[PDB]
Amino acid sequence: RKAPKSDNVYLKLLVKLYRFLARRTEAPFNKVVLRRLFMSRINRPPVSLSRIARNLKNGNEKKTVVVVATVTDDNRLLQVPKMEVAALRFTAKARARIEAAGGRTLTLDQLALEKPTGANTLLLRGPKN
Amino acid sequence: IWRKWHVKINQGQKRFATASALAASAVAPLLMARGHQVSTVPEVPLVVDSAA
Amino acid sequence: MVAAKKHVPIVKKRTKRFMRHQSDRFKCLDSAWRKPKGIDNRVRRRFKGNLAMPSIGYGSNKKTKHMMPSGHKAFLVHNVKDVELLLMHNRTYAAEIAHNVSSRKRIDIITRAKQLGVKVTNAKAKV
Amino acid sequence: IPPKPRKILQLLRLRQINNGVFVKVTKATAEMIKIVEPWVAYGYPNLKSVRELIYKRGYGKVNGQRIPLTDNAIIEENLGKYGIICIEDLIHEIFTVGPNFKQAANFLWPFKLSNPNGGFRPRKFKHFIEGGDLGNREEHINALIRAMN
Amino acid sequence: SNVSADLIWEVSRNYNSFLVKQRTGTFSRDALNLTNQHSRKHAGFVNDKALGIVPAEKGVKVIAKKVKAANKPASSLYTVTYKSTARKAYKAIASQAAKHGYRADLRQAAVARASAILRSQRPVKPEPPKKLRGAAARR
Amino acid sequence: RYAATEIAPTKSARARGSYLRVSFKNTRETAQAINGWKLQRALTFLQNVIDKKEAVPMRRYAGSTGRTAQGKQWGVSRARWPVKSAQFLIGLLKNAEANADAKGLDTGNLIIKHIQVNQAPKQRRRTYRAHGRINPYMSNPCHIELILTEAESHLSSRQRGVRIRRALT
RNA sequence: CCCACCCAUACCCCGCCCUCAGGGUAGAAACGAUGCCCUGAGGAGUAGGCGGCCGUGGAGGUCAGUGACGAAGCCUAGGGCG
RNA sequence: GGGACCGAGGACCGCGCUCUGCAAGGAUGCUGGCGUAAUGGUCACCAGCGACCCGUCUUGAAACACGGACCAAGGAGUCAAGGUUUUGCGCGAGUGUUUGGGUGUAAAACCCGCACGCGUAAGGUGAGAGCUUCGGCGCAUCAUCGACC
RNA sequence: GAGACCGAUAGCGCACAAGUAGAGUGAUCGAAAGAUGAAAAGCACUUUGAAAAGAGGGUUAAAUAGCACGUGAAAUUGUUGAAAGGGAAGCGCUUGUGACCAGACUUGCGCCCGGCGGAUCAUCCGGUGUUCUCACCGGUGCACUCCGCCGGGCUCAGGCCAG
């Protein structure tokens, strides 16, 4: 794909930023993020707070969590650990619960500033099935 | 006469659009791009005293 | 000024039009091109000695497209404000006053265009 | 054309008419050509034929593109890992069939030759030994190459 | 923030009140547009730093944007009228466009616009009489 | 309005008739017979047609038309005597002659410069036919107009050099 | 049996059009980036599928748009663009 | 040595050579006539070569058959309900104001109290995108052994 | 009271003396058909004609608006102008003839002299505005500096077809 199917102006800016990064860097992280900005919404399933909490259980703490999707809230999780999450969108409850725990929420353009090469990052995807 | 003349729009999207319209009204370049003669007025979000 | 920018020679691959099939025979059929949809018509099958079919092969050079023989590109103009839009394009564009512009407004457009050095395609209509 | 000769011509990169390729003689390759005899004329080229084919009609397959061989840097960038760094190394590889003939020949885009100057023969679709143009001419392919170049 | 030159271009690239569209090209009526062409380089109202030249009674009137007054239109344009020699006008305009990092890409375009206005202010030569040919000449 | 608009009305005399109940085809042929003639010659000819002394040639509308020796003057065999058409043409020629007298022209020098016959809106009359059909008998009227008028170098250097030498010698 | 010659849209070289594919383009002297530049290949086409563009009636905003010094419409062995 | 067709690009950069330079990543130099219907273009006609009348239907295909005197205007996959797939948008374990009520510059726009429709109330091993402090960590998904109801 | 409706083959069959004219024994069936001009100012008068009308003359901004009335396409027809035509015409490629035409060009740029006509010449000082180092106003700068014109010389670039 060359042009995203979305009509969002800010999504076009994100694509333009990461198209520049993918061309001028050798990081496969930037190519994955760029290609995920192009795909459809059904191809970008939501990632819940429970799923991200599972994936940093072992040793992936103090890392940057990056999903090119919307981050949702889960009522099954009673305690939310401190984490660094960057995503396309956050729900009102998921953003509040992350900030209440003590973590920080980022956008994809802030991620480019902080981690232009995807260093120390945990990249996840939602359940396709 | 049964032709679905009216359109159902989510109240969330209606309020999103109004917020975007208000924000664009504070942007000086967009005022000129829409045909408004904004050259002799200061403070594009022009606030006049309620006493006047 | 009157002289246009230096350009490659203007070539036209085909000069005559693409007449519609059997439009020479019927008055109801206009000469405007229509693609024949029949399965046995010899125009569609490209038999020799028949009318040609328009195609992208006849496409004119990109560097010479939309240029009149003088080497300018026509820009339709309705008032004096339109010719000042051409101030930066003396050598690349020419002014074409619209068919509904009055006689007195035409004099103003031509007077301004001469000041700007912009060529007018129809400067002698109502003179 | 029957399906069997069609596949061989695709495998020999003989897609259009007057396309020429270099093949090293081998029982694996000899039998392939013997099946496409009613469509090909082949023989043994000399040094002049190899030299003028590469110099005048030599194009390389660089990243899937047909790039003319106008400089030694083109050959070295694509065939320098085998020891071929110039135009004469490429000719030497093809003429004196060396260890890297497969890489040198496949690098060479199939040659696009003109129709012969002087014609083929009164009847060109008979075997060469019957007065035609098809089959093995052996050292007579050089005279044909001069006409098509 | 949410508003930038990149956003205003995205909002206003396809349609504007300044846009003129025909078959032979797209023009712009923006007063801060040096070449009157629709492009991000030349869209004055989009850009934070931009230039524009308009004729005066004698000379040129150059307007530049003030970055610290983007929300005050009445005090957002730095206006200089050049009524001296043509060469002095070109020197100031080019220095205005390049000596401090204020749209050095528009240096050549700005000087050309000043030249065209000064040339257009010159007296006009009378056109030669029209010559008839062939059938028209014989009638 | 008139069709021949290149004639100044001050130097000419004109006459006109509209919705005239005569055969269009017959009137067209007899108008063509007197085209370009003198006024007095046409008047004598049109009278002779009524008395069957001269015949009007049928050029275009002559399908299955008889032959006479009076057509030999025109070079055709098919000629006829449109009496009704001649009478209408006589009246218009007399009227145009009267208009010429009022203006002051010379009637002995007038020629028929322009004569035209056009078609009028058709009239209708239904006749009775067998097998359940009613046949129409549409008439064919015509318009007539006529006007009377008085009878009355960029040579090359080689080309220039050659011409100078030839002029000297 | 031998020599030369004739010509297909077929083969070779060059120009132009379009499509596809592969590359470049920001401490921006910077861009209809939906753009521009470089290289290579390809071009019949019914049913069918996808994309762009043209035209008509009406609506919103916009061109401080055109017009009795003449809108629209109609005629044109008068031109320009595609 | 004698002809023919062509001159694409537009500051420099490269490979090079016979180096005060050059035929080396694409034409320059000198000269003449004319500067107007002269080149060029549109029509009509003559001339040389070329060229079946369209559509429908049937059939492997033709042929037959059917419709066609001419022109202008009109003229045929639309609307509604219910399913369903894909794209964009909002919110997201929730979502849906517009039956209704309350304002209004009054069929617009703005707001929402109670129900209601649809949905919801944690392992081992091998691959595997992507990170890496080079030791390893491992999304989604698949294969296998699981665990629970 | 309104319309993102239709605009005289549309919209109700009916924008008009329309459920009328007309058809059928009857029940019933059922059309076509709007527009001169701001104002009739709807052509006095003269002449030819039996008349219908025609021609002058006149009203009018217009009769190229005369109640066969806004604008007035095509099929079809007349006249005039041009051309072609030994059992079809029409169509494609390429010249030629004849008629008819759109462009292009008319000079610009820059140097060297001479005659001028005028102080927005460089610098410095004050004020102001800005992109904070760049400008603009006022003064100084009253002439080998600067700006426009005119008269010469020269360079370069300029249209078409060619060698």
mmCIF file of C-alpha atoms in Angstrom, chain E:
data_model
loop_
_atom_site.group_PDB
_atom_site.id
_atom_site.type_symbol
_atom_site.label_atom_id
_atom_site.label_comp_id
_atom_site.label_asym_id
_atom_site.label_seq_id
_atom_site.Cartn_x
_atom_site.Cartn_y
_atom_site.Cartn_z
ATOM 1 C CA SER E 1 -0.123 21.044 20.000
ATOM 2 C CA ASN E 2 -2.786 20.085 17.460
ATOM 3 C CA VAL E 3 -2.250 22.817 14.833
ATOM 4 C CA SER E 4 0.803 23.197 12.604
ATOM 5 C CA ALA E 5 1.731 24.174 9.066
ATOM 6 C CA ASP E 6 1.599 20.487 8.132
ATOM 7 C CA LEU E 7 -1.984 20.234 9.393
ATOM 8 C CA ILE E 8 -3.203 23.389 7.641
ATOM 9 C CA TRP E 9 -1.767 22.093 4.373
ATOM 10 C CA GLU E 10 -3.519 18.741 4.842
ATOM 11 C CA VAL E 11 -6.823 20.472 5.599
ATOM 12 C CA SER E 12 -6.492 22.976 2.749
ATOM 13 C CA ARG E 13 -4.600 21.110 0.008
ATOM 14 C CA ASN E 14 -7.651 19.939 -1.945
ATOM 15 C CA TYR E 15 -9.826 23.048 -1.558
ATOM 16 C CA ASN E 16 -9.318 26.688 -0.597
ATOM 17 C CA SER E 17 -10.996 30.026 -1.120
ATOM 18 C CA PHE E 18 -7.726 31.101 -2.783
ATOM 19 C CA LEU E 19 -7.611 28.135 -5.174
ATOM 20 C CA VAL E 20 -8.051 28.589 -8.926
ATOM 21 C CA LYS E 21 -8.245 25.341 -10.896
ATOM 22 C CA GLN E 22 -8.268 24.913 -14.676
ATOM 23 C CA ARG E 23 -7.094 22.265 -17.123
ATOM 24 C CA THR E 24 -3.666 23.835 -17.668
ATOM 25 C CA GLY E 25 -2.712 24.259 -14.011
ATOM 26 C CA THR E 26 -3.660 25.308 -10.508
ATOM 27 C CA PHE E 27 -3.134 28.876 -9.295
ATOM 28 C CA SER E 28 -3.592 30.614 -5.949
ATOM 29 C CA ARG E 29 -4.815 34.120 -5.114
ATOM 30 C CA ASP E 30 -3.026 34.219 -1.748
ATOM 31 C CA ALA E 31 -1.440 37.598 -1.038
ATOM 32 C CA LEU E 32 1.514 35.852 0.648
ATOM 33 C CA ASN E 33 2.113 33.653 -2.420
ATOM 34 C CA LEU E 34 5.128 34.691 -4.484
ATOM 35 C CA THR E 35 4.561 32.483 -7.555
ATOM 36 C CA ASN E 36 0.743 32.191 -7.320
ATOM 37 C CA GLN E 37 1.128 28.406 -7.539
ATOM 38 C CA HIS E 38 -0.538 25.848 -5.278
ATOM 39 C CA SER E 39 2.267 24.163 -3.350
ATOM 40 C CA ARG E 40 3.381 23.698 0.238
ATOM 41 C CA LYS E 41 6.529 25.672 -0.587
ATOM 42 C CA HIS E 42 4.530 28.673 -1.790
ATOM 43 C CA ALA E 43 1.321 28.511 0.296
ATOM 44 C CA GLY E 44 1.916 31.593 2.410
ATOM 45 C CA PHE E 45 -1.090 31.279 4.710
ATOM 46 C CA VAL E 46 -0.105 27.708 5.602
ATOM 47 C CA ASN E 47 3.487 28.471 6.575
ATOM 48 C CA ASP E 48 4.641 30.086 9.808
ATOM 49 C CA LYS E 49 7.296 32.066 7.905
ATOM 50 C CA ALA E 50 6.188 33.456 4.549
ATOM 51 C CA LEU E 51 6.644 36.430 2.242
ATOM 52 C CA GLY E 52 4.497 38.415 -0.152
ATOM 53 C CA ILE E 53 5.029 41.338 -2.504
ATOM 54 C CA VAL E 54 2.281 43.681 -3.712
ATOM 55 C CA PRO E 55 2.683 46.800 -5.895
ATOM 56 C CA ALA E 56 2.669 50.296 -4.425
ATOM 57 C CA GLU E 57 2.190 53.690 -6.067
ATOM 58 C CA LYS E 58 5.895 53.578 -6.966
ATOM 59 C CA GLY E 59 7.922 50.530 -5.986
ATOM 60 C CA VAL E 60 6.970 47.377 -4.088
ATOM 61 C CA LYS E 61 5.287 46.625 -0.765
ATOM 62 C CA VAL E 62 6.760 43.555 0.943
ATOM 63 C CA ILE E 63 4.886 41.815 3.766
ATOM 64 C CA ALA E 64 6.344 39.141 6.045
ATOM 65 C CA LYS E 65 4.743 37.109 8.813
ATOM 66 C CA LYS E 66 5.620 37.698 12.462
ATOM 67 C CA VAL E 67 5.916 34.309 14.152
ATOM 68 C CA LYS E 68 5.177 35.708 17.622
ATOM 69 C CA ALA E 69 1.871 37.227 16.428
ATOM 70 C CA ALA E 70 0.200 34.356 14.578
ATOM 71 C CA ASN E 71 -2.960 34.876 16.658
ATOM 72 C CA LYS E 72 -3.071 38.679 16.139
ATOM 73 C CA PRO E 73 -3.851 39.368 12.462
ATOM 74 C CA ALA E 74 -3.825 43.154 12.870
ATOM 75 C CA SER E 75 -0.205 42.965 14.090
ATOM 76 C CA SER E 76 0.989 39.884 12.199
ATOM 77 C CA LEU E 77 2.458 41.415 9.014
ATOM 78 C CA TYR E 78 5.805 43.204 8.834
ATOM 79 C CA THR E 79 5.319 45.697 5.992
ATOM 80 C CA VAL E 80 8.098 47.557 4.171
ATOM 81 C CA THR E 81 7.552 49.775 1.130
ATOM 82 C CA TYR E 82 10.571 50.110 -1.172
ATOM 83 C CA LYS E 83 10.376 53.223 -3.362
ATOM 84 C CA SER E 84 14.110 53.666 -4.050
ATOM 85 C CA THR E 85 16.150 52.212 -6.927
ATOM 86 C CA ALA E 86 15.400 48.697 -8.141
ATOM 87 C CA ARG E 87 18.774 47.300 -7.062
ATOM 88 C CA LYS E 88 18.326 48.578 -3.505
ATOM 89 C CA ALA E 89 14.890 46.951 -3.346
ATOM 90 C CA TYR E 90 16.357 43.620 -4.474
ATOM 91 C CA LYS E 91 19.140 43.816 -1.882
ATOM 92 C CA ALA E 92 16.740 44.366 1.013
ATOM 93 C CA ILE E 93 14.227 41.745 -0.140
ATOM 94 C CA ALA E 94 16.889 39.065 -0.599
ATOM 95 C CA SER E 95 18.514 39.902 2.741
ATOM 96 C CA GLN E 96 15.017 39.857 4.227
ATOM 97 C CA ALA E 97 14.586 36.350 2.813
ATOM 98 C CA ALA E 98 17.992 34.754 3.423
ATOM 99 C CA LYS E 99 20.290 36.585 5.866
ATOM 100 C CA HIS E 100 18.545 35.317 9.022
ATOM 101 C CA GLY E 101 16.971 31.993 8.031
ATOM 102 C CA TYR E 102 13.521 33.343 7.129
ATOM 103 C CA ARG E 103 12.584 31.334 4.023
ATOM 104 C CA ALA E 104 15.911 31.253 2.192
ATOM 105 C CA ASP E 105 14.195 28.985 -0.342
ATOM 106 C CA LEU E 106 12.044 31.958 -1.397
ATOM 107 C CA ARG E 107 15.009 34.270 -2.052
ATOM 108 C CA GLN E 108 15.002 33.794 -5.820
ATOM 109 C CA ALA E 109 11.202 33.825 -6.057
ATOM 110 C CA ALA E 110 10.899 37.021 -4.010
ATOM 111 C CA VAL E 111 13.445 38.985 -6.056
ATOM 112 C CA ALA E 112 11.740 37.892 -9.277
ATOM 113 C CA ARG E 113 8.358 39.081 -7.994
ATOM 114 C CA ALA E 114 9.817 42.490 -7.150
ATOM 115 C CA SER E 115 11.383 42.675 -10.617
ATOM 116 C CA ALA E 116 8.085 41.896 -12.357
ATOM 117 C CA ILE E 117 6.219 44.591 -10.419
ATOM 118 C CA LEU E 118 8.903 47.181 -11.178
ATOM 119 C CA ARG E 119 8.931 46.150 -14.844
ATOM 120 C CA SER E 120 5.130 46.358 -14.965
ATOM 121 C CA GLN E 121 5.304 49.936 -13.674
ATOM 122 C CA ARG E 122 7.413 51.013 -16.652
ATOM 123 C CA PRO E 123 5.801 52.951 -19.538
ATOM 124 C CA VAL E 124 4.256 50.843 -22.284
ATOM 125 C CA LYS E 125 5.534 50.831 -25.863
ATOM 126 C CA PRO E 126 2.848 51.428 -28.507
ATOM 127 C CA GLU E 127 1.994 48.269 -30.401
ATOM 128 C CA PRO E 128 2.764 48.116 -34.134
ATOM 129 C CA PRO E 129 -0.153 48.457 -36.566
ATOM 130 C CA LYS E 130 -1.830 45.200 -37.514
ATOM 131 C CA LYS E 131 -1.075 43.771 -40.955
ATOM 132 C CA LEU E 132 -3.744 42.122 -43.098
ATOM 133 C CA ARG E 133 -2.903 39.116 -45.264
ATOM 134 C CA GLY E 134 -4.273 37.339 -48.302
ATOM 135 C CA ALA E 135 -8.026 37.567 -48.764
ATOM 136 C CA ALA E 136 -8.431 40.050 -45.907
ATOM 137 C CA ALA E 137 -5.747 42.301 -47.402
ATOM 138 C CA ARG E 138 -7.434 42.275 -50.821
ATOM 139 C CA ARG E 139 -10.829 43.318 -49.422
#
